[PDB]
Amino acid sequence: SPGIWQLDCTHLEGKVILVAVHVASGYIEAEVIPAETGQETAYFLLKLAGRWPVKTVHTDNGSNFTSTTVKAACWWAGIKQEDGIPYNPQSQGVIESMNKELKKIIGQVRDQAEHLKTAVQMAVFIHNHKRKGYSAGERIVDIIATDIQ
Amino acid sequence: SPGIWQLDCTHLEGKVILVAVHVASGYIEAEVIPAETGQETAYFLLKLAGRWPVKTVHTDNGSNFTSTTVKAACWWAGIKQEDGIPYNPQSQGVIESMNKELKKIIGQVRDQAEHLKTAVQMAVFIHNHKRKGYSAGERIVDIIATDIQ
Ligand SMILES: C=CC[N@H+](Cc1ccccc1C(=O)N[C@H](C)CC)Cc1ccc2c(c1C(=O)O)OC[C@H](CCC(=O)O)O2
Ligand SMILES: C=CC[N@H+](Cc1ccccc1C(=O)N[C@H](C)CC)Cc1ccc2c(c1C(=O)O)OC[C@H](CCC(=O)O)O2
Ligand SMILES: [Cl-]
Ligand SMILES: [Cl-]
């Protein structure tokens, strides 16, 4: 499970925040996009896979799962595209709690930037650095390093 | 050493490719921007620091070093903003060769995407995964994990 990520789409301020969560660590990357499209999702995954060793992505919905644009990016980047069915019911709850936390952080920083995209990157920073004790940023590096060995 | 990054700005197709290089590993992140401005550079560094434990950035030129927008982002993200003077003359050479490699890879993928930004992300992926043996992606994780311990 060092290579497993989950896609998550949440909404704020009439815009869409696309999030990828590293399941084992809770580490995240995120971007603000005007709307979720196959193209936006494909480009996001391409970026993610160039930066971390992405083996599997649990897609956030059936449209992205079906999208030939998304499938082409997953093919290119060597990603196994999977469904995101919450067979473990706790995954729904975890994602919802993450979305709430992220929105809370965005509110806390919202005044320190004009644009939502900036606030979202500040939220990513705070989330990844927060010690819960290790941070999610520390956990992901440790998990992957262990795997490489 | 685990936290040192170098900024690098290169040009292609009338656009600017802003690159951050993790000096110890040769791992990179990059983006295409219309022009290098303080705001573009500040936003890039904010993203980078939310994703990796960025301690020090060697800025790519005096304008970004001076920029109060860049300084404000470095303050926010806890980054030590430094000059990028190549006291070790091998630095210029390494960056020049990296820029050449990246442009080579971009040409090799250029037909697999309509937009330069896509080709640049493909180039990041190829660069970071290339075994030279370990890849740059493996080296950065190993270096930081060693630091965390
Ligand atoms: C209809 C899809 C368009 N492309 C089809 C394509 C066109 C020409 C050649 C190959 C391919 C192709 O399938 N390529 C390989 C196999 C997979 C990468 C690929 C693509 C995807 C997402 C993007 C892109 C681009 C682009 O063509 O550059 O451009 C930036 C855009 C930014 C996000 C946003 O604006 O939504 O995200
Ligand atoms: C003139 C600078 C602008 N801002 C000044 C600002 C305005 C209001 C409140 C605080 C601050 C402030 O200094 N904040 C803290 C201390 C530092 C983050 C900050 C900023 C920087 C880069 C960006 C931004 C934004 C933004 O205001 O959101 O928006 C997206 C843009 C995308 C790249 C591009 O388009 O160039 O990069
Ligand atoms: Cl971090
Ligand atoms: Cl990688």
Side-chain angles (χ1 to χ4, degrees):
Chain A
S1 94
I4 290 166
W5 293 74
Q6 169 73 240
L7 286 181
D8 160 45
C9 183
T10 196
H11 297 73
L12 197 67
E13 289 179 24
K15 296 195 192 59
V16 166
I17 303 169
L18 189 50
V19 185
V21 189
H22 185 255
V23 170
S25 67
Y27 170 95
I28 69 171
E29 303 228 358
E31 63 165 22
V32 170
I33 58 180
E36 196 186 46
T37 67
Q39 246 180 99
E40 289 287 8
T41 301
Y43 182 73
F44 183 68
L45 293 171
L46 180 61
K47 294 197 283 182
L48 184 70
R51 284 156 180 74
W52 294 100
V54 178
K55 173 186 187 194
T56 303
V57 63
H58 294 275
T59 50
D60 57 321
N61 57 53
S63 298
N64 273 337
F65 185 65
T66 303
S67 167
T68 57
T69 294
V70 174
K71 281 178 195 300
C74 285
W75 165 79
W76 197 95
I79 296 168
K80 190 176 179 179
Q81 187 209 223
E82 296 191 352
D83 64 62
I85 301 172
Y87 294 106
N88 190 302
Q90 285 198 351
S91 61
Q92 297 171 86
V94 166
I95 287 169
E96 290 159 3
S97 295
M98 188 194 67
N99 287 343
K100 181 164 77 168
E101 171 210 331
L102 280 180
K103 284 173 186 180
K104 176 179 146 181
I105 303 164
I106 292 161
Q108 292 171 358
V109 302
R110 197 55 194 86
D111 73 310
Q112 296 174 59
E114 176 159 33
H115 308 295
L116 181 60
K117 61 196 288 184
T118 314
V120 166
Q121 301 308 322
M122 286 174 167
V124 170
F125 181 110
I126 287 162
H127 174 84
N128 286 340
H129 280 82
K130 178 190 198 194
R131 298 182 176 281
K132 266 169 58 164
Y134 294 115
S135 62
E138 294 167 330
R139 301 189 292 265
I140 190 174
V141 168
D142 287 339
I143 290 160
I144 299 171
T146 304
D147 188 62
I148 293 160
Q149 314 320 319
Chain B
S1 196
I4 297 160
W5 294 74
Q6 167 75 240
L7 284 179
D8 160 48
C9 180
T10 195
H11 298 75
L12 198 72
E13 288 181 27
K15 295 187 185 63
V16 169
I17 303 170
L18 186 55
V19 185
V21 187
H22 185 255
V23 170
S25 66
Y27 172 94
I28 72 174
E29 304 225 1
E31 68 171 13
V32 172
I33 58 184
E36 199 184 46
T37 67
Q39 270 186 67
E40 291 288 4
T41 300
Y43 185 70
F44 184 69
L45 291 172
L46 177 61
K47 296 198 279 181
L48 184 73
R51 288 156 175 74
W52 293 100
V54 182
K55 175 185 172 188
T56 299
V57 168
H58 293 277
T59 53
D60 55 322
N61 57 53
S63 293
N64 273 340
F65 187 64
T66 306
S67 169
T68 57
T69 300
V70 173
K71 282 182 192 301
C74 286
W75 165 79
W76 195 96
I79 294 167
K80 289 188 182 187
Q81 186 212 43
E82 294 190 355
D83 65 65
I85 299 165
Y87 292 107
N88 183 340
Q90 301 226 123
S91 304
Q92 304 105 98
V94 171
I95 283 154
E96 192 172 63
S97 298
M98 191 203 65
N99 287 344
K100 186 180 174 171
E101 177 225 50
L102 287 178
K103 286 176 184 177
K104 186 175 190 64
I105 299 165
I106 292 160
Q108 288 169 359
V109 303
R110 198 58 195 85
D111 70 315
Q112 298 176 57
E114 175 171 3
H115 306 294
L116 180 59
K117 63 193 294 184
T118 314
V120 168
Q121 303 308 320
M122 287 173 167
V124 172
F125 180 110
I126 287 163
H127 173 85
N128 286 342
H129 288 257
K130 181 175 185 193
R131 227 163 307 263
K132 254 208 274 45
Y134 292 109
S135 62
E138 286 167 337
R139 301 186 292 261
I140 188 169
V141 165
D142 282 343
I143 289 163
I144 301 171
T146 299
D147 188 56
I148 296 164
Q149 323 320 315

